[PDB]
Design a protein around this ligand. Structure first.
Ligand SMILES: [Mg+2]
Ligand SMILES: [Zn+2]
Lengths: 81, 129, 155, 150, 260, 184
RNA sequence: UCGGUUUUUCAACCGGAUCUUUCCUUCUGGCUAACCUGUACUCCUUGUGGGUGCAGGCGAACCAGGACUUUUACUUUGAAAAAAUUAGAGUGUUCAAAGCAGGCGAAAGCUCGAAUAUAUUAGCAUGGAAUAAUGGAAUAGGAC
């Protein structure tokens, strides 16, 4: 289509394409720090956690991995960092 | 599997030319392809090539003039001797004198005329025009 | 290659025309003769240190080396003092501008000095027709790939 | 293209750029290494270890944080599996298939799948043999596979 | 099959004789001789065609058997006598002396010389052996042997022979930077100084040779024949100084010399 | 200071750097005890074409981690004290020669001892903890290699007015033409 | 200038030499030839014009001797590929195919000849080291 800049892609166009198909092959996955209702400190959980996860000392389920992402149990607060 | 990366790149370029599109995306790229592109630029067949040669393998984007007609390959890279170069030119290049047969020689990757000047033939890598 | 059990045969093996004096003993008792073959192919110390026999030997025998020196891969040692070396190829057919692949099973002689195993790069030189097929004999044996003796089992 | 069955499938795990930092995902490399070692001791495959790391600890890749990959690290500390993970898994699968066949014989699809698996194993095996990993001559039939099991 | 070849066909003949391919079906096979059949030049090929002193075989025979003809020393009664390189032909009539030396392009040119230089032959050393009783002898390139030489004579060296006696007066040691003659192959009859040796292991040993016109050419030691110091030759060279001129140069010469 | 800092022997620049280091130590708690493992190899006060200068320091490769652990504040202090000359920390990486067709090949030659990768590493280092996310390369019509270096917008205030200087430094080091960029 | 000839101003096109942050197998010396050199100073235009010259010190300009060298596949150059034939010079076999002669004086006697090019691939030695494999130091028995 005459000219399209395949080096400066727009923020929406890149989003439209998946993961690897973009000019820079980077994960869409942002893995999170969690604040569970029991513990008092942050712990790292992956967005697509694969297996069962425990918080710190007590065996408390944080995320149930079904399909793509992880089903975060009950309702916890989280950031991208 | 993709066997010859350079070949694929050239095909892509050709397709772009056919379309009238003035940009490409060479997928695996690197080294040989880059040198080929440089050679082309030397005579001004492609406008300007820029690669996101990242931390993986490399991806070339070619902002091209569109003046290029066709750019071949031949992946059975035949060992060209100093005499049958003429024959090759006759076969591959359209005009008697316009166009460049790309040779990977011991002296480096360059066009046919340049190779002749250095008096070193090598192996055929491709051609433009 | 052979190794060990030297004289043990029907006829007792002698290095011909050369002699060791049985009247007085000197330092290392037996004198075994050896030649520096030439062409820059280094003599094995094991040929002098270890005392075998072999008339066909490039080093300790009356066998000389002049002609063409070829290199190939060791394929067959299921023999005795003989080695089958596959030479590689690129026979160019003019018609198609392309190369064939071919096999030449050059059979050669392996001096008891040299330790050779199946699947190794081997240098061979021309000789007097020493057998029906054997007209070559070992000059130097390198490593298998790069590792000397590191090939072992898992943890 | 996905070897045996027809179907392309572009399901692939991405790896990001800058093979050094992810800084706010803290913890020294030594600690990570120790954790890995512990996991190995408890009896887990490198892949499994990686998965565990993904689950719990502030890691991205061991090749990023430490200088080495997980298998390499294991090799260095002499805590590697007998038959390199994937191969082991394949052999297990083969064994299972054989058992199934023994139980019920006429299942021809199963037989076909077994054959495919065997072929795959052979393919793997040859390459392993080449890269000086496994000792020369390695049989993958019911006389040895059964013995291997785990 | 069966035995040695006696005849020779006028096509199977060596090239640098330039014999008339049509007139005649047999060439002269030179007899058993000093030089190699390929290198050597027989008298009938020379006398009949190069000098034009005869026109027939009978004529040649007449010339020879009357014993006016002398090669290096003796007369040689036979027709088919092999005369190769550096050999002196003294004819008793008018004292027309020749040395058989090659030309620029490879031919045995009729080089006319006086009795002063036509008194000694130059001879390449083939081998040095210690013979019976413990006697060193030197082997000339013309098969000839001289017993008791200079002890510092090695192979590829060149030696003076006074012809009247089988004796060495002087020799030119083989040295890089000594003017030389080439005797065979694609490059024949050219002259240069020898730049560098290539020693090599097991057969075939090359030397790089440079002429006055700055044109390098590499040749085997087999065809290399030393003439002397750079600047001074020991043998008078054919016209054009025996330097292999380019085709263009030849054309120019042709186009410059239209004189009548 | 001749054995503590220099690791070699000569040069007035080296002496100056040592003096600066000593001055930095005189602060006492956080800026003395935290930094006594550091060694200062070759320094080149290399200039930007028309303007300010840049102090290009080379330091040991077995460390670097230590420098990263400290750095930043130290660099700032150096900038403050030695007047308007841009401090840069680099590693003395060897670059082993290309295995020729002739010449005796001593060892495999480590992939850590190449050219291009080494240069990339240097580039990564030279930009003080800000990090690259793209090494895109423009190749001009004439035949000139010019590299864009993609920087993330998160913390660019540390460099900001040092980009040109950085580029100049890189050019002086190699000859490769370098540019830095931040996306929207 | 008496149609050819080379400096300069400039372009282009390689080639080789270079230190470059980055090396040519390596020395055991033979031998050095030239200066980083300088020891005395000067022939002489006020002196880096000019170098004979031996006591610290240039490796390559090849000699001969080891020690080991990842190997090849390519390609270049060279050597080879007997002649006849083919391609192709020169030459009025009356022309032509031919052949290899002839042509030129004063027609009383002296010189140009009879070239070269390919004929590929298999081996032979070199220039090149991009392309394509191949192999280096992971249980280091690794390197200097
Ligand atoms: Mg013809
Ligand atoms: Zn809780």
């Amino acid at each position: 289509v005459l000219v399209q800049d395949l080096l400066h892609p727009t923020a929406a166009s890149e989003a439209r394409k998946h993961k690897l198909k973009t000019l820079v092959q980077s994960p869409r996955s942002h893995f999170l720090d969690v604040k569970c209702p029991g513990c008092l400190n942050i712990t790292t959980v992956f967005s697509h956690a694969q297996t069962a996860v425990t918080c710190e000392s007590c065996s408390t389920v944080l995320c149930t991995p079904t399909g793509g992402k992880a089903k975060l149990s009950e309702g916890t607060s989280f950031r991208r960092k | 599997t993709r066997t010859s990366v350079l070949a694929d790149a050239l095909n892509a370029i050709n397709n772009a030319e056919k379309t009238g599109k003035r940009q490409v995306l060479i997928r695996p790229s690197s080294k040989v392809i880059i040198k080929f592109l440089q050679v082309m630029q030397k005579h001004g067949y492609i406008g300007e090539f820029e690669y996101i040669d990242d931390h993986r393998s490399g991806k070339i984007v070619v902002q091209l003039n569109g003046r290029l007609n066709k750019c071949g390959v031949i992946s059975p890279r035949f060992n060209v001797k100093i005499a049958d170069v003429e024959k090759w030119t006759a076969n591959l290049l359209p005009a008697r004198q316009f166009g460049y047969v790309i040779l990977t020689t011991s002296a480096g990757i360059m066009d046919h005329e340049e190779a002749h000047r250095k008096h070193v033939s090598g192996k055929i890598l491709g051609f433009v025009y | 290659s052979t190794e060990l059990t030297v004289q043990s045969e029907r006829a007792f093996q002698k290095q011909p025309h050369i002699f060791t004096n049985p009247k007085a003993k000197a330092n290392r008792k037996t004198k075994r003769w050896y030649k520096n073959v030439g062409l820059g192919f280094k003599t094995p110390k094991t040929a002098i240190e270890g005392s075998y026999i072999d008339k066909k030997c490039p080093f300790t025998g009356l066998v000389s080396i002049r002609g063409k020196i070829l290199t190939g891969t060791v394929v067959s040692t299921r023999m005795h003092r003989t080695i089958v070396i596959r030479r590689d190829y690129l026979h160019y057919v003019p018609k198609y501008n392309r190369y064939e692949k071919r096999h030449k099973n050059v059979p050669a002689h392996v001096s008891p000095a040299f330790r050779v195993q199946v699947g190794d790069i081997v240098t061979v030189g021309q000789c007097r027709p020493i057998s029906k097929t054997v007209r070559f004999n070992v000059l130097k044996v390198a490593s298998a790939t790069g590792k000397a003796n590191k090939q072992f089992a898992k943890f | 293209g996905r070897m045996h069955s027809k179907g392309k499938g572009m399901s692939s795990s991405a790896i990001p750029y800058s093979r050094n930092a992810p800084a706010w995902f803290k913890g020294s490399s030594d600690g990570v290494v120790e954790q890995i070692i512990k996991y190995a001791r408890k009896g887990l495959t490198p892949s499994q270890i990686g998965v565990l790391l993904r689950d719990a600890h502030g890691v991205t890749q061991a090749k990023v944080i430490t200088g080495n990959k997980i298998l390499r690290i294991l090799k260095s500390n002499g805590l590697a599996p007998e038959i390199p993970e994937d191969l082991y898994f394949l052999i297990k699968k083969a064994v299972s298939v054989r058992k199934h066949l023994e139980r019920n014989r006429k299942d021809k699809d199963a037989k076909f799948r077994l054959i495919l698996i065997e072929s795959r194993i052979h393919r793997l095996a040859r390459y392993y043999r080449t890269v000086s990993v496994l000792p020369p001559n390695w049989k993958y039939e019911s006389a040895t596979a059964s013995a291997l099991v785990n | 099959a069966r035995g040695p070849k006696k005849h020779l066909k006028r096509l199977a003949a060596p090239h640098h004789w330039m014999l008339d391919k049509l007139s005649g079906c047999y060439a002269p096979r030179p007899s058993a001789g000093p030089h190699k059949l390929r290198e050597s030049l027989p008298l009938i090929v020379f006398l009949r065609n190069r000098l034009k002193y005869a026109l027939n075989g009978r004529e040649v025979k007449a010339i020879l058997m009357q014993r006016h003809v002398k090669v290096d020393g003796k007369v040689r009664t036979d027709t088919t006598f092999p005369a190769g390189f550096m050999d002196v032909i003294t004819l008793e009539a008018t004292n027309e002396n020749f040395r058989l030396v090659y030309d620029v392009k490879g031919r045995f040119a009729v080089h006319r010389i006086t009795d002063e230089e036509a008194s000694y032959k130059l001879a390449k050393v083939k081998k040095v052996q210690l013979g019976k009783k413990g006697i060193p002898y030197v082997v000339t390139h013309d098969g000839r042997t001289i017993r008791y030489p200079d002890p510092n004579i090695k192979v590829n060296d060149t030696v003076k022979v006074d012809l009247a006696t089988g004796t060495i007066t002087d020799f030119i040691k083989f040295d890089t930077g000594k003017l030389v003659y080439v005797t065979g192959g694609r490059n024949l009859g050219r002259v240069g100084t020898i730049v560098h040796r290539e020693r090599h292991e097991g057969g075939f040993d090359l030397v790089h040779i440079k002429d006055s016109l700055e044109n390098t050419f590499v040749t085997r030691l087999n065809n290399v024949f030393v003439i002397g110091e750079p600047g001074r030759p020991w043998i008078s060279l054919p016209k054009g100084k025996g330097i292999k001129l380019t085709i263009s140069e030849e054309r120019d010469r042709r186009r410059a010399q239209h004189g009548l | 200071p001749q054995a503590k800092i220099l690791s070699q022997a000569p040069t007035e620049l080296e002496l100056q750097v040592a003096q600066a280091f000593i001055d930095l130590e005189n602060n006492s708690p956080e800026l003395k005890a935290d930094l006594r493992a550091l060694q200062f190899k070759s320094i080149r006060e290399i200039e930007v074409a028309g303007g300010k200068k840049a102090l290009a320091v080379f330091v040991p490769v077995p460390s670097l981690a230590a420098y990263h652990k400290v750095q930043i504040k130290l660099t700032r202090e150096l900038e403050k004290k030695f007047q308007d000359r841009h401090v840069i920390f680099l590693a003395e990486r060897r670059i082993l020669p290309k295995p020729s067709r002739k010449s005796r090949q001593t060892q495999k030659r480590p992939r850590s001892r190449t050219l291009t990768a080494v240069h990339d590493k240097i580039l990564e280092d030279l930009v003080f903890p800000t990090e690259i996310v793209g090494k895109r390369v423009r190749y001009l019509v004439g035949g000139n290699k010019i590299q864009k270096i993609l920087l993330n917008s998160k913390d660019v205030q540390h460099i900001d007015n040092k980009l040109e200087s950085f580029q100049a430094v890189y050019n002086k080091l190699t000859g490769k033409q370098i540019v830095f960029e931040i996306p929207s």
